[PDB]
Amino acid sequence: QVQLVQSGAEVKKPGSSVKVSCKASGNSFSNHDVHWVRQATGQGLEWMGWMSHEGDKTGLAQKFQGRVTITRDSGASTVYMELRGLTADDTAIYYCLTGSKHRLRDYFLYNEYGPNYEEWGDYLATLDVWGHGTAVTVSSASTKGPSVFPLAPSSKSTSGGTAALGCLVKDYFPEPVTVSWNSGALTSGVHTFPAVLQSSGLYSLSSVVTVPSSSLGTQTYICNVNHKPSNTKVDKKVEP
């Protein structure tokens, strides 16, 4: 159970470059191949490149040809992936990972009069340990804490003994934001929606919860909003 540690989230302007780093417990990149995989929100896995733990082989996807450098320090203590010429299309979570290969002799021709003719190939057998990822956001936006507005429970959010209420978490950058209710004490019937990216380049999301209509007179509802990038911590009471 090797653990991979990745560098922190970054925001980069279109046209610039990011260099992501990765370390493995026990210096495991010495003995296990490194892979890079990225994934944009709501989209598929995309293999980027790899380096053999032997340090004698590197490869990239066709799309990253001329865009990406994969390198490591001596003793393979840290591994790096540099992506240049960033666009909004490069906004994704970038994962570092270990994998296993089969290094096999593909070509062999017997030479009776000296060393043999050989060619060896690498074949990917497994992707093993995934890092937690590094979120890279490609945008010219400025860090901004959200405004938090109540979604008040009313007759227009109530029926059959149940009411809905929520918080609108408007205009923040970058991701991520976390939301809890009553300091984690309220979890049943909570829906916290994925953020949407607005035209302004800022994000918004809402969190809603359904509760018994009965309880509106007596139970307090507070949404707790945390936006670490801006050190913004908001507790908002939601009244009828």
Binding site: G44, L45, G131
Partner: protein, 217 residues
Amino acid sequence: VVITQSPLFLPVTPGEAASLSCKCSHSLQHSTGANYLAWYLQRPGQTPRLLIHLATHRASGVPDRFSGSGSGTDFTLKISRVESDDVGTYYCMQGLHSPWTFGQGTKVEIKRTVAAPSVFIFPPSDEQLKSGTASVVCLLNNFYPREAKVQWKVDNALQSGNSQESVTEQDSKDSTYSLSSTLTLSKADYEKHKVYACEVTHQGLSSPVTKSFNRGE
């Protein structure tokens, strides 16, 4: 070298079997005999978990209801007795031809009976209005299947280009989805109109449902 996964979207009745196809334009069999094809499950919020490697081998700790087969170009992942822990996206990955590549994925969800959304509407807060903007929020709660349509009306006029929506992941307990839509206007536009309405279409509704309020009361 191309990979096609099929189907793109697969609803499965709990306890029923599932069958996923991964086909490649080129053989994935090395001359030594091994097929370099792997299957991965990615659940919402998680990194992918290896299920099957070298086409037919379960990975360590993978329950025996997952099984892989196939050789050459055509490969299958069977899941017997599907449950909510099996929900997510399944990717195959070919490891024979450099550069290595993932398939585009098959999305698997729990199939359940039809459920129309409960629809709730929220006017903008007095605090938000103070700042010169009005967001109206519509919530569609606990519906299935995932396909739903929200149309915002202002004094019955159809709106476009001023709203955004977001859908949750499938609830593991009741197998439903929830959706929120947010209409955004300036305070100025918002105060020129009276009726704000969220009109909703879904397989579970025999005709569209409108939730509305009048500005003020």
